[PDB]
Design a protein around this ligand. Structure first.
Ligand SMILES: Nc1nc2c(ncn2[C@@H]2O[C@H](COP(=O)(O)OP(=O)(O)O)[C@@H](O)[C@H]2O)c(=O)[nH]1
Ligand SMILES: Nc1nc2c(ncn2[C@@H]2O[C@H](COP(=O)(O)OP(=O)(O)O)[C@@H](O)[C@H]2O)c(=O)[nH]1
Ligand code: BEF
Ligand code: BEF
Ligand SMILES: [K+]
Ligand SMILES: [K+]
Ligand SMILES: [Mg+2]
Ligand SMILES: [Mg+2]
Lengths: 330, 330
């Protein structure tokens, strides 16, 4: 419940005063990537539910979506400051929840705008879920298409920058394996925010399409070894997080990914490695990295609180953080 | 043979003095688009031969390739200033020609460079070929990958600008239908060079992949009607110019495209139109547009020659152009 404590420190910290005495440098896992690279698909394989706007060919995530993942006895979801439990095993609840999320996303987008920086906050609890706080972000673009507000590209870059810029955020850089590395839009921003790769994890999606279309299966190995993209990362993972145009289920997608990798030239040849491979493996590394960064960040931000009290002399913000750092040490 | 006359005016005009008294404003069809959008694939369906470096996932066209297409009794290809006929019906000739083109492309790229502006010139003659002069260009990129020279992205933009900037060039804007319109790299340059769409033709490739993956088949109609991409064009065509990772044959690809479109929801519903559809249709429009622009350009460039002779007072350049404008009027 300490993930529960953490998240309440997070969403009472916002609020968002935003100043010298109150910086928000607490770890979140921030999911960035070109439009349709599969950011939301990765999120849904980790949350294990089909609940968010998702689809190929167009802009689907039009505002940030903050998901706190915690352990629980039933797969459930609740909005922030709400008591309604959506039962993620019931299709009627899933369908209702998809509608409720789309409606809030549409509500956030003001009249002459295409995208919003207003967050949608949701808790997902479930048996065996990794504990973590993620933020799914709008896909970065290069071309503003007809109907969109003219500023949309720069607004989307601005929303991604706002979250990657937090020095203790984990940057989960989602990279479409089915599209030439040279076509990538997000690489430059990722490289600016974390030049040395101290808090970035790299995810290559759609490797099944890569085999089904690409003329150099060694370039996949070159990517996963950090040798192709001009950026650094703590780790590199290859992943299969969907198939086709129609929404499948999480279990169908997980089966498909397992089949693909166990039949893939890349693993049987040991071109790339087994620990580098499924979303499950990515999940574990991301959770480890998130918790390590939380344990290395809270005190120094305890520290900040301490500095604030007197240096000058942040009220109940400091004591929620103090309760959490209390629990945190076993 | 007047296409033959034209081409010799072209490649004796280069040379390339490049000045006030000698601008090169003669029509060429200039094939531009993001890396792997399928520029070379379109060229090969029009030339009807598998001879050029081509493939998904990486940079394949590393220098401009000028192809003059003319009518002939046998499908043949010759390099500029060469007598060797490659018989495009013989696989040994095709294979040799692929090797010879790759070798010249590699020869053009200087030691610390990735791409070259040095052209490779080739004549392809054949029964029923459209008559035309095309220039296949390197794919525009957004991210310089490891191993490439650092300037490569700007050099590639510079090579494309050099050719689109000719005020009488037809810009053949090749646009990958399998990747979100918002991800497009080349749209902005196309919009700069021909803002009003007076000399641009728009080609949407990979519509088969679009059906096999994309979540809005109405967006294809919106693209072909000029209503999605922030650019203007004289016309819009949807096209299928390959399939998979292994090189098929031109005839296999043409069969595949015919099958796909005749079984496609888009044509049977008449979402988009039949004249808007195959590469063959694109071919005819591009040839018509090229010849119209030649007939509307040569005299005014006859005009230029005339101006040069005395205004001041370009030697045998003017008389080849004069011979061609002579023939040109039946
Ligand atoms: N074949 C294949 N398709 C995928 C994979 N991952 C995602 N997709 C598809 O890509 C589409 C766009 O994904 P989405 O999650 O909305 O991307 P986002 O905009 O980056 O959040 C989804 O509808 C999936 O169908 C994969 O590993 N393989
Ligand atoms: N499925 C499908 N694949 C295509 C189509 N057009 C091209 N391709 C594939 O896309 C790959 C990259 O094409 P290429 O012509 O080298 O692109 P270029 O870099 O833009 O010149 C080719 O190897 C083809 O296999 C199409 O209409 N459908
Ligand atoms: F539409 Be995605 F999430 F970029
Ligand atoms: F490699 Be391509 F011709 F852009
Ligand atoms: K998407
Ligand atoms: K290519
Ligand atoms: Mg998304
Ligand atoms: Mg090419």
């Amino acid at each position: 419940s300490l993930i529960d404590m953490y998240s309440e420190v997070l969403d009472v910290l916002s609020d968002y005063d935003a100043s010298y005495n109150t910086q928000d440098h607490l770890p979140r896992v921030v999911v960035v990537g070109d439009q349709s690279a599969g950011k939301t698909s990765v999120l849904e394989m980790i949350a294990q539910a089909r609940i968010f706007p998702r689809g190929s060919g167009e802009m689907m995530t039009r505002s940030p979506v903050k998901v706190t993942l915690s352990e629980g006895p039933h797969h459930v979801a609740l909005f922030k400051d709400s008591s309604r439990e959506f039962d993620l095993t019931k299709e009627e609840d899933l369908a209702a929840l998809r509608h409720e999320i789309e409606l809030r996303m549409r509500k956030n987008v003001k009249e002459g705008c295409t995208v919003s920086p207003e967050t949608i906050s949701l808790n997902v609890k479930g048996p065996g879920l990794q504990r973590m706080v993620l933020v799914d972000l709008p896909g970065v673009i290069n071309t503003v298409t007809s109907g969109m507000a003219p500023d949309t590209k720069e607004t989307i870059f601005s929303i991604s920058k706002a979250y990657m810029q937090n020095p203790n955020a984990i940057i989960l850089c989602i990279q479409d394996g089915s599209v030439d590395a040279e076509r990538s839009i997000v690489t430059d921003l990722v490289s600016q925010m974390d030049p040395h790769g101290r808090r970035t994890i790299f995810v290559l999606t759609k490797v099944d399409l890569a085999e089904k279309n690409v003329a150099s299966p060694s370039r996949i190995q070159q990517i996963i070894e950090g040798k192709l993209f001009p950026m650094k990362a703590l780790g590199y993972f290859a992943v299969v997080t969907g198939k086709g145009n129609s929404s499948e289920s999480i279990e169908a997608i997980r089966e498909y990914e397992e089949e693909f990798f166990q039949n893939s030239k890349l693993l049987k040849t040991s071109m790339l490695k087994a620990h580098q491979v499924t979303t499950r493996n990515l999940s574990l590394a991301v959770s480890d990295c998130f918790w390590k960064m939380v344990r290395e960040s809270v005190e120094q931000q305890a520290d900040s609180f301490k500095a604030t009290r007197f240096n000058l002399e942040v009220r109940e913000i400091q004591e929620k953080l103090d309760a959490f750092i209390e629990a945190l040490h076993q």
